[PDB]
Symmetry: C3
Subunit: 193 residues, 3 copies
C-alpha cells in the first residue's frame, strides 16, 4: 500500500497537535485553571511516614484540589483512607456532562509496576444544586489498571440536564490496604451555551 | 516511494526531540525562568465573577508575569480590559530581536471552540532604553484564530540594533466584549554575543 | 519493504505513550513528588546579577531541591560555584540502584548553543547510612554536551546492596568560568521490594 515520508510527517504533526491539546482534545470543566473543588470531599490521608524522616520545612500535603490539577508526576495525587471516598467539584461552567476522564500514573513509573492505590469502581453524580440535594447518578464505571493511564468514560444515555456541581465517588480501589489515590479527574460536556 | 519502519522511528524521535525543545526550538529571551515583566503594563482584569461563588482562600489572579510563563492550560493567561492593551518586558539578555511567538489555548479546549479573547492585531516595540524613550516599532502582525495555537512572527527587515526592553502592544482582539487574554509571549533573537 | 498508514499510527501512539512516561519510562526514586534533598549539598550560587536590575519582589533563587523537580525550562536549574560540587539525596524508597539520569537544557534553547555550565564528569555514591559513613562509589560517568539533553547512565556491575541515600558529585563542567548548573538528576533501581 505504502506511506510516503511526508505523509509520515503529517501524521506526526497531527499526533503532536492532539497530544498537546491536553492529550485527549476535550475541554475540562473541572480544571481548576477555570473553576474548582468544594470540600464535601473525603478526609485526606498522607501516603507516607517517610515523614517519620519527617516534616521537611518546605513540605505540605496534597489537598483534594490536586485532582483538578494537570500535574500528574508520581508525587501528585490526592489520597483518602481505604477503598471508598469522594470529592465534590464545582465546574467552571454550567454544562451538560457527556463524559469524564480519570488518570493514574503509568505502571512504568511505579514501584514494581503496581498501581494498587488506583481507583477501580466509581460513580458520577449531578447536583442540580449549588447545594446538597441528594445527587442524580450520571454514570458508573471502572478504571482499568491495564489499559492506558488516561481513561475517558462517556455517559450511556444522558439527559441534557445541566449541572455545575458533580461528585466523584469512588467505590473500590485496585487492592491497596491503606488508601486510594487520585491523580486527575476531568469533566467534559456541552455548555449551557 | 515508501518509508521503512525504522525511518518512521527516526522521524518520530526527531519530532519528539523538537516538540520537547519548547516546541519551536528557539531560545525565548522573554522567559521569566531567565529574565522578566516590568509593569508599564495594562491594568489587569479578572476574567470572571464565578467569584460572585467567590474568593476561594487559595485563589489569586493572573499577574502579567503569566505571559512569560510556559504554563498554558486553559486557566493560565493574563487579561486586560477591552480589545487594546500592553505589556512591557525586560529580556533576560540584550539581543537583536529577530522574531516573536504568541500562543493561545487550542480551540479544542475552549467553550464552543471560541477563542474570541484571543489577541488579533498586535505590535512590537524596542525601547533602546532601560527607560521610556518612546519605542521603535519592530513589527506589526496578526494572530490568526485559525492556524495553530503557537504562532511565530519574524521581523521583515530588522536592523541589528539591540534591545533588552520590548513592548507587546495589542491592537484588536477576536471580538470579545469584556477583555483580551494573553497566554504566552516569547522573544527570539541573536545575543549581543 | 514498506509501512502502512496504520502501522505509522501505532508507532506514533507508542512513542507518545513512552514520551509521556517521564520520557524514559523508568521510575525516579529521587523525584521530590515521592521523597527528597538533604543539604550536605554544595553552597548555591545565583547565575546572575541582572539582579544588579535587581530583586524582583516575587523572585527567589533555585534551592538544590530543583534537581529533583521535573520542570526543566531554561530558568530551572541549581547552580554551584566553579566546576566541582555535590548534592546528597534521600530517595523515596530503599532501592538497589541500577542507573541514574542527568539532563540539561537543549543546546537549541541556549544563548549561542552553548551549554558550558553543563556538568561533565561526575560520580555517584551510596551512603548505606541514613548518615555520613563515607560513601561507596557506585559509578563514574561523563555527561556529553552533544548527545541528547536527557542521558541515562547504568552501573557497570552493581552489587544488590540497597541504599536510600546517594550523592551526586560533579567533577568537571563543560568549561564555564563561574559555575555549573544542574537541571534534573534521577535515580533508577529495584526496590527492596
Amino acid at each position: 500500500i505504502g506511506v510516503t515520508e511526508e505523509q509520515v510527517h503529517h501524521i506526526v504533526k497531527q499526533a503532536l497537535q492532539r497530544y498537546s491539546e491536553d492529550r485527549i482534545g476535550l475541554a475540562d470543566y473541572a480544571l481548576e485553571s477555570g473553576g474548582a473543588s468544594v470540600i464535601s470531599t473525603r478526609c485526606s490521608e498522607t501516603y507516607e511516614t517517610k515523614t517519620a524522616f519527617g516534616i521537611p520545612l518546605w513540605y505540605h500535603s496534597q489537598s483534594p484540589r490536586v485532582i483538578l490539577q494537570p500535574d500528574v508526576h508520581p508525587g501528585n495525587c490526592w489520597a483518602f483512607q481505604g477503598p471508598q471516598g469522594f470529592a465534590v467539584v464545582r465546574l467552571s461552567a454550567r454544562i451538560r456532562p457527556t463524559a469524564v476522564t480519570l488518570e493514574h500514573v503509568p505502571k512504568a513509573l511505579s514501584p514494581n509496576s503496581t498501581i494498587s492505590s488506583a481507583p477501580k469502581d466509581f460513580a458520577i453524580f449531578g447536583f442540580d444544586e449549588d447545594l446538597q440535594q441528594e445527587g442524580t447518578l450520571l454514570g458508573k464505571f471502572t478504571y482499568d489498571q491495564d489499559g492506558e493511564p488516561i481513561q475517558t468514560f462517556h455517559f450511556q444515555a444522558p439527559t441534557m440536564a445541566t449541572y455545575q456541581v458533580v461528585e466523584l465517588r469512588i467505590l473500590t480501589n485496585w487492592g491497596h490496604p491503606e488508601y486510594t489515590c487520585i491523580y486527575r479527574f476531568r469533566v467534559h460536556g456541552e455548555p449551557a451555551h
